[PDB]
Design a protein around this ligand. Structure first.
Ligand SMILES: [Pb+2]
Length: 149
């Protein structure tokens, strides 16, 4: 079963140590119940610890939400290859916990297209770079978050 895909942009401003993530949209999200009510959480992490959290508004009853919602984080130059930006799409439930639809992260210890997006940001400072990412199962991303390069 596919969980969906998420589009976001990354921008790093080295002089000011400012990291901006814009959640653009998601597509083909998993239908969670017998349609999902997606919102997106961002966690900035450094070695298991949460430095900052942000989240988008909620788009009710859609597998294909459009957000274009921007979030900024303070990350000094010397720390930018030590953090992870963790992006989770969740299903808002009025009565009960909000279950995760899928998850992805970018940062130096990411891989494949996640690493490429992060590296393209760092190679092209001050410019937002947009890219799509395949959402993965929360527990599998959590496992990989713990593998250092
Ligand atoms: Pb729901």
């Amino acid at each position: 079963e596919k969980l969906g895909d998420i589009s976001f942009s990354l921008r790093y401003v080295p002089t000011a140590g400012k990291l901006t993530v814009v959640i653009l949209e998601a597509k083909n999200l998993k239908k969670m119940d017998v349609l999902s009510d997606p919102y997106v959480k961002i966690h900035l992490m450094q070695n298991g610890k949460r430095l900052k959290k942000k989240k988008t508004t909620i788009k009710k009853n859609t597998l294909n939400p459009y957000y274009n919602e921007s979030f900024s984080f303070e990350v000094p130059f010397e720390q930018i290859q030590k953090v992870q930006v963790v992006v989770t799409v969740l299903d808002y439930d009025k009565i009960g916990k909000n279950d995760a639809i899928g998850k992805v992260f970018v940062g130096y210890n990411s891989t494949g297209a996640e690493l490429r997006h992060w590296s393209d940001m760092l190679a092209n400072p001050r410019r937002p770079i947009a890219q799509w990412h395949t959402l993965q199962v929360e527990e599998e991303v959590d496992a990989m978050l713990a593998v250092k390069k």
